[PDB]
């Protein structure tokens, strides 16, 4: 059999596959996440925050 | 410039592994199926395995079945063959070889491209 990839599949999004929410998705809380500090966050300060009373 | 260059030779007593590898670049690795084929003087040239595109499906030749695994990595473009429980019939050189000057359909299986080939000997 043909072991190449075939470029003559469709490259169009498929709008028939489902759009309801699965659940069936695990809901448990996953440790694998990334336990260590994110350096990459921003370093700024925010001028967004609400500067009201 | 499609280049094949392969690594991991040398020489192993039998009943041992050893482990080749394959480097690719010039291409779309992760588009084409890679073949190992080998090359017994006396012999003549040979088929080992065969990986697809993805590693779905691995198929191997009846005098290796059982022994090596072939498997790949699309993100760093190497081809991989584990030679486990080597014997003296499996002294040869090894090249890696791709599957198809391009893609057709109806026309697969033979090999476009060549490595260099690597030399792997099992004796004491």
């Known amino acids: 059999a043909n072991p190449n990839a075939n470029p003559n599949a469709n490259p169009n999004a498929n709008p028939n596959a489902n759009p309801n929410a699965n659940p069936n998705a695990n809901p448990n809380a996953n440790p694998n996440a990334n336990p260590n500090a994110n350096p990459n966050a921003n370093p700024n300060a925010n001028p967004n925050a609400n500067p009201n009373a | 410039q499609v280049q094949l260059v392969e690594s991991g030779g040398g020489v192993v007593q039998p009943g041992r592994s050893l482990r080749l590898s394959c480097a690719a670049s010039?291409?779309?690795?992760?588009?084409?199926?890679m073949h190992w084929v080998r090359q017994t003087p006396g012999k003549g040239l040979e088929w080992v395995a065969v990986?697809?595109?993805?590693?779905?499906?691995?198929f191997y030749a009846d005098s290796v079945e059982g022994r090596f695994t072939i498997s790949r990595d699309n993100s760093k473009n190497m081809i991989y063959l584990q030679m486990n429980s080597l014997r003296v019939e499996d002294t040869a050189i090894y090249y890696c070889?791709?599957?198809?000057?391009?893609?057709?359909?109806?026309?697969?299986?033979?090999?476009?491209?060549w490595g260099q080939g690597t030399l792997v000997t099992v004796s004491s």
């Open positions: 070889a791709r599957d198809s000057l391009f893609y057709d359909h109806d026309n697969s299986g033979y090999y476009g491209y």
């Open positions: 010039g291409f779309t690795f992760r588009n084409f199926g």
């Open positions: 990986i697809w595109h993805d590693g779905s499906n691995k």
